[PDB]
Amino acid sequence: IVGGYTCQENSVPYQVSLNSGYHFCGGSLINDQWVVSAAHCYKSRIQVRLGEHNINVLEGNEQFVNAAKIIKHPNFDRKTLNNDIMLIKLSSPVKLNARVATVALPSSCAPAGTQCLISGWGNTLSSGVNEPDLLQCLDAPLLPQADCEASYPGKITDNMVCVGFLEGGKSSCQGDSGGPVVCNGELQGIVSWGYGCALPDNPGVYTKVCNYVDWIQDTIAAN
């Protein structure tokens, strides 16, 4: 994330780190054995790291659990990143506490103007590259669909929602991908795609989670 601020130590307990030798994506704990992330962050061998602030140092309040089953959305479109959502089942239930806690699924779709929080260890520079140690945060509204269409003409489906600014040079970036977007105590989006750190003067596009509540539930039931 560019133009954001270092989050308060463990202020985002539902944030996890998808690691495969190195951190590559973010996700969210939805229960003591299931994590939600972006489908494009799929890998055959994934280790989930929870309760972490400084991703490059062992603080003591962390938990590392391997993935036992990774389930992408049947209709995931790698070309248009449509239906860009994936569920991950942990090999062992994680011991929930203050540092490691869940996040609620949307009871409804958040209307335009709603304020949200974006987190992750993505790139923080507009020119060059820099992988922060500490978890970065950014407060950004949920732009109307009209604004979403203007920036990415004819590329927005019903399962996508824009969040960000049109100026100010603040936005999500690669590394933050698959990471949570919480609006009003609920998970409303998943860092999917957009111009990123390079063109911060454009809103980003996220998966519209309020559309998959049924799927998530039925999946968690049958597995």
What positions carry a catalytic annotation? 40, 84, 177
Cα distances (Å, whole numbers) of residue 157 to 8, 61, 85, 175: 35, 40, 14, 23
Under the binding rule (CB under 8 A), the answer on residue 40 touching a second copy is yes
54 is in an annotated binding site: yes
DSSP string, 8-24: PTTS-TTEEEEESSSEE
The single-letter DSSP state of residue 7 is P
* CA gap 182, 15 in Å, rounded: 11
Which residue number, 60 or 74, has a Cβ lying nearer to Ca ion? 60
**Site membership for a second copy, residue 128 (CB under 8 A):** yes
Q: Binds 199, which of Ca ion, a second copy, none (CB < 5 to 8 A, cut-off by type)?
A: a second copy
Kindly indicate which of the ranges 109-117, 139-147, 192-200, 207-215 contains the residues binding a second copy, using the contact rule CB under 8 A. Answer: 192-200
Partner interacting with residue 26 (select from a second copy, Ca ion, none; CB below 5-8 Å by kind): none
Residues in contact with Ca ion, counted by CB under 5 A, come to a total of: 3
Torsion sign, CA atoms 139, 118, 172, 76? negative
52 binds Ca ion (CB under 5 A): yes
Asked if residue 70 binds a second copy (CB under 8 A), the reply is: no
Q: Which residue numbers belong to the known binding site?
A: 52, 54, 57, 62
Name the residues that contact a second copy, by CB under 8 A. 22-25, 40-41, 43, 79, 81, 122-123, 125, 127-131, 153-154, 174-175, 177, 193-199, 201
- The annotation places the binding site for Ca(2+) at 52, 54, 57, 62
